[PDB]
């Protein structure tokens, strides 16, 4: 499972590009995550976005594992 910690790390990596649209996969190999701001949260200021309530998540598999 893509850990919450790993998802939080990714959200901080893309803290500038995080948006209402699905992001790229967080990993090149293995089970990563795609995140977006929930539609109902799009108007919250950046510093008030909550991990549990405001971020939608979805598993993504990549296989650049050579």
């Amino acid at each position: 499972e893509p850990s919450d910690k790993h998802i939080k790390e990714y959200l901080n990596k893309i803290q500038n590009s995080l948006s209402t649209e699905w992001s790229p996969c967080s990993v090149t190999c293995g089970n990563g995550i795609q995140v977006r701001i929930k539609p109902g949260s799009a108007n919250k200021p950046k510093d008030e976005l909550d991990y549990a309530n405001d971020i939608e998540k979805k598993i993504c598999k990549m296989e650049k594992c050579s």
Partner: antibody
Amino acid sequence: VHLVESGGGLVKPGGSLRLSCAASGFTFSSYTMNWVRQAPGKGLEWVSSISSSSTYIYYADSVRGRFTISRDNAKNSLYLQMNSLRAEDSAVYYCARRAGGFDAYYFDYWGQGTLVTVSS
Amino acid sequence: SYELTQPPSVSVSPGQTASITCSGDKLGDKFACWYQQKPGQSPVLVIYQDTKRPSGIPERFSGSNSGNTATLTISGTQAMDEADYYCQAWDSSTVVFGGGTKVTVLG
């Protein structure tokens, strides 16, 4: 980026005092801000945090119900209203800016601090 | 976290590696941060989000967070690194600081 605290001084046991923190060099209105304190010769103790919009406010258990954090995004200033003060509350009070997102938070800038002395 | 435990004091000679641990229930799930405080001065961030170094911090400072222990390591500890060091994590919106660790440089 500058954080300048003010308002420290003598207060009698059971008394009140208001601290201020004037911020410069960044978009104050977009950051969560915090008060942290440090008794003489002892460790750091978080006091309170206030979100940009003042919607999300939290307090340490040690001060809950006696202290009130607030901000005037207008004057790029943060405030801490302290009431029913005790000697245990004597400390340097620091203004600190929160950075990071999604539980990966840290304080990247601190003020020089203002000293509060609670004494008869 | 909700109770972070660092050793009161750490002593080393110049040039050797100083290690400060910071212990907390489930701390591996959190993001540890480290602050240096010299006497009479405000804290300075040296490590954030477990392992990242602010732009102006020397490379000899490093951080790790595994299991339930975060560690600050100063390689080639210099006399200028003498200071109090505080670990810090978030829990339930409550910001928790460790008790602080004074590093003494011997000799």
